[PDB]
Amino acid sequence: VCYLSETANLGKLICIPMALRAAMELNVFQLISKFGTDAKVSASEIASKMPNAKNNPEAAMYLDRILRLLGASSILSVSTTKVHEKLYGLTNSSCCLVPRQEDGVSLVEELLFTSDKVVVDSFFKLKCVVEEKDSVPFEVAHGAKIFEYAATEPRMNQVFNDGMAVFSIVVFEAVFRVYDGFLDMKELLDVGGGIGTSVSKIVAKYPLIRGVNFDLPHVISVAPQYPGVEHVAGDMFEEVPKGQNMLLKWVLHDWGDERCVKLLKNCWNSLPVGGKVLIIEFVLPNELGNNAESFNALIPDLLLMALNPGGKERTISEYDDLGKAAGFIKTIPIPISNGLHVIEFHK
Amino acid sequence: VCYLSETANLGKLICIPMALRAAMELNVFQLISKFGTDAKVSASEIASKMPNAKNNPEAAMYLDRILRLLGASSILSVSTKLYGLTNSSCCLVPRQEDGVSLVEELLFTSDKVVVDSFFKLKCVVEEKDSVPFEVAHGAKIFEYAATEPRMNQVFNDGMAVFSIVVFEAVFRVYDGFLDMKELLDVGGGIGTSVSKIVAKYPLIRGVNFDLPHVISVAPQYPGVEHVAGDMFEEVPKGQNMLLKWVLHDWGDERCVKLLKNCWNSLPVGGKVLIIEFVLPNELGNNAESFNALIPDLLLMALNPGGKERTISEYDDLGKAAGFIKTIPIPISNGLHVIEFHK
Numbered sequence: 001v002c003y004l005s006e007t008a009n010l011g012k013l014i015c016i017p018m019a020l021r022a023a024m025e026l027n028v029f030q031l032i033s034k035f036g037t038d039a040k041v042s043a044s045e046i047a048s049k050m051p052n053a054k055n056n057p058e059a060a061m062y063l064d065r066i067l068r069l070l071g072a073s074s075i076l077s078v079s080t081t082k083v084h085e086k087l088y089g090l091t092n093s094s095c096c097l098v099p100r101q102e103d104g105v106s107l108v109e110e111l112l113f114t115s116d117k118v119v120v121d122s123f124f125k126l127k128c129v130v131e132e133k134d135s136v137p138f139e140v141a142h143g144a145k146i147f148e149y150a151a152t153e154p155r156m157n158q159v160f161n162d163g164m165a166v167f168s169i170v171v172f173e174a175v176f177r178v179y180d181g182f183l184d185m186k187e188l189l190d191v192g193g194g195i196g197t198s199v200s201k202i203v204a205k206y207p208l209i210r211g212v213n214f215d216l217p218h219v220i221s222v223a224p225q226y227p228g229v230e231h232v233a234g235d236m237f238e239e240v241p242k243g244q245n246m247l248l249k250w251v252l253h254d255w256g257d258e259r260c261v262k263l264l265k266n267c268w269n270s271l272p273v274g275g276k277v278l279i280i281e282f283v284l285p286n287e288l289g290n291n292a293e294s295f296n297a298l299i300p301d302l303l304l305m306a307l308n309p310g311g312k313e314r315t316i317s318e319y320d321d322l323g324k325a326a327g328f329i330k331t332i333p334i335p336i337s338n339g340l341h342v343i344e345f346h347k
Numbered sequence: 348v349c350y351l352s353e354t355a356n357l358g359k360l361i362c363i364p365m366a367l368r369a370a371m372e373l374n375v376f377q378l379i380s381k382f383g384t385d386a387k388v389s390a391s392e393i394a395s396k397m398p399n400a401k402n403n404p405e406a407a408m409y410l411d412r413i414l415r416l417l418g419a420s421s422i423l424s425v426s427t428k429l430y431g432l433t434n435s436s437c438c439l440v441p442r443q444e445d446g447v448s449l450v451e452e453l454l455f456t457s458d459k460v461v462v463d464s465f466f467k468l469k470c471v472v473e474e475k476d477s478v479p480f481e482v483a484h485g486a487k488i489f490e491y492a493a494t495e496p497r498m499n500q501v502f503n504d505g506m507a508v509f510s511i512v513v514f515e516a517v518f519r520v521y522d523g524f525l526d527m528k529e530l531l532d533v534g535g536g537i538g539t540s541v542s543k544i545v546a547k548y549p550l551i552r553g554v555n556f557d558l559p560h561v562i563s564v565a566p567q568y569p570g571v572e573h574v575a576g577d578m579f580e581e582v583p584k585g586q587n588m589l590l591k592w593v594l595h596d597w598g599d600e601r602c603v604k605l606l607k608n609c610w611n612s613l614p615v616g617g618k619v620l621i622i623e624f625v626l627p628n629e630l631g632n633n634a635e636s637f638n639a640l641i642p643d644l645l646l647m648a649l650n651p652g653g654k655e656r657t658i659s660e661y662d663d664l665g666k667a668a669g670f671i672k673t674i675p676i677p678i679s680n681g682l683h684v685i686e687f688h689k
């Protein structure tokens with residue numbers, strides 16, 4: 001029990017992420033690549049390619065103090081050239097924050113959500129979800145309910161959307177590459193489909209696809225016109241349209257076990273025998289490593305527990321436990337990437 | 348570019364510490380200790396012995412969910428879920444002897460007031476003379492602390508515990524005090540520092556030197572003698588001086604004045620004792636790097652005037668004050684005792 005290591009070892013748990021979130025906020029990773037592939041610059045250099053830092057002499061040293069920490073975290077590479085300066089360079093998990101040449105996707109939007117003040121405020125009240133009966137960290141921490149806050153609070157809406165959005169562009173691109181069980185299907189229906197996007201994209205790698213979008217009236221009300229897509233409003237708990245194969249990306253984790261039955265029922269009772277409710281979650285591995293498949297589950301099981309804790313991420317066991325108790329012959333799960341599955345529930 | 352690799356590496360960065368805070372806030376780490384050496388207690392059982400949660404049907408359902416993350420984190424031991432303490436975890440259990448642990452100090456480092464300031468870190472790179480704490484909170488840190496008690500206690504409990512641990516280290520490794528008859532603790536605080544030392548080396552006469560307003564409240568200690576004043580104008584006379592967590596609070600300019608005054612109130616063969624965490628010349632995923640980075644950040648957020656420093660930089664302050672010798676004395680994971688000899 002060496003306290004003065006257990007310090008620097010637990011003391012950094014809070015620092016690393018808020019140092020990171022400042023690099024992002026200051027668009028460091030971008031400005032670094034606007035210098036070349038496998039490159040290396042001083043904070044002095046990066047504080048020059050920064051607009052709001054004109055007329056703050058300390059800009060360069062203060063920045064060097066942040067980057068040193070990321071550079072020590074591995075979240076950045078670092079090297080010193082001959083009067084000796086610290087020069088900075090990108091990494092694997094650090095290029096994943098350079099916005100792409102074409103479409104602009106990055107984890108920036110995803111990571112600014114996770115590390116967002118609204119969220120952390122909500123984390124700071126986790127304690128409660130154990131202690132109090134039904135308490136919601138989010139609710140305990142803020143005026144009232146999440147949809148209430150988010151209505152009356154534009155920038156919280158921006159960040160929760162922009163995150164789940166870039167993170168979809170990425171969660172999907174690798175649904176493509178692996179899974180190809182989209183072509184012995186002509187018709188597909190997105191239950192809790194959002195405003196299409198999911199299908200919009202699908203019915204464009206598979207143009208021979210009857211793209212249907214099912215969500216709440218107020219959602220589809222806003223929802224734009226994708227060629228491929230026909231939209232449908234309802235309450236998937238009361239009844240789901242008819243369709244061949246159906247799609248449930250990030251619906252089942254928002255919902256309890258009983259409410260996951262009642263949905264999957266209505267999903268079957270409107271599926272032709274031969275079609276399948278496709279389920280796209282991050283799956284909770286049964287033994288939990290430092291394994292990314294283990295953090296890709298745990299991270300959201302937390303965010304759920306903080307903002308909507310009636311939610312839950314599940315083991316592949318726990319998902320066929322559902323597929324079955326609805327009434328589904330198969331339950332044939334396809335590993336995709338680092339914990340992202342397509343559990344298939346067959347009727 | 349594996350988007351769903353780095354999605355976990357970075358995603359967890361903010362989940363561990365808030366998750367850990369929740370475990371501390373709920374007692375977990377101790378309660379797993381209160382089941383005998385190298386135990387392995389369970390989510391349901393730990394809830395079992397947790398009074399403030401004795402009427403939450405879902406309690407253990409929710410707890411297991413946090414612990415998992417800690418398990419994966421490696422702060423706890425999987426054992427399949429049957430959780431149990433570790434090297435890391437053990438440092439979170441209030442001791443038999445004094446009830447001390449790292450808790451008080453982490454519960455501090457990760458307190459809302461501090462994170463809230465952290466959220467404005469960008470501002471110290473953008474606006475000149477800007478103070479994250481200040482951007483974030485109404486007032487300046489002292490005004491704020493003056494009027495919010497629970498923040499001000501958390502900063503106390505935090506620093507308190509931390510010193511204890513740092514002193515246990517310094518005492519176990521540093522001879523220096525043995526042939527000392529007088530010790531002046533410049534910036535001494537309430538003299539809890541110089542008292543602990545005089546207790547361990549009683550042929551040393553303790554003098555505690557701080558701001559009047561501080562001294563005005565210090566308790567009475569055997570062989571400690573309180574002296575109020577303003578170390579920037581003059582420091583009292585003493586055979587030797589102690590400077591603990593003082594230099595790292597101030598610009599180079601202000602430091603060498605504090606050091607010129609120390610020299611002027613020293614004999615010849617008198618020495619100043621800098622106790623700081625030294626910032627390595629090469630940073631790395633090691634305790635000696637993070638033990639200097641954590642403060643250097645906390646500084647930027649709560650005191651941009653201050654900075655951690657490198658054995659060479661401290662030395663440069665020494666010479667500029669006019670000391671003739673610097674002896675750097677490594678203690679533990681970056682902790683030094685620096686001697687400036689006059």
Ligand SMILES: C[S@@+](CC[C@H](N)C(=O)[O-])C[C@H]1O[C@@H](n2cnc3c(N)ncnc32)[C@H](O)[C@@H]1O
Binds near residue numbers: 194216251
């Ligand atoms: C996490 S989002 C799904 C995101 C979307 N699949 C994507 O990948 O972009 C959950 C969706 O469930 C929808 N939803 C919630 N309750 C519903 C209900 N009763 N009927 C239909 N849709 C519902 C919401 O409107 C929301 O769009």
Ligand SMILES: Nc1ncnc2c1ncn2[C@@H]1O[C@H](CSCC[C@H](N)C(=O)O)[C@@H](O)[C@H]1O
Binds near residue numbers: 534535558592
């Ligand atoms: N001009 C000045 N004169 C004397 N003491 C001062 C001062 N400016 C700051 N201080 C004192 O320096 C201390 C800062 S740091 C904490 C001191 C001590 N090493 C400890 O571990 O307990 C404060 O208590 C503060 O009042």
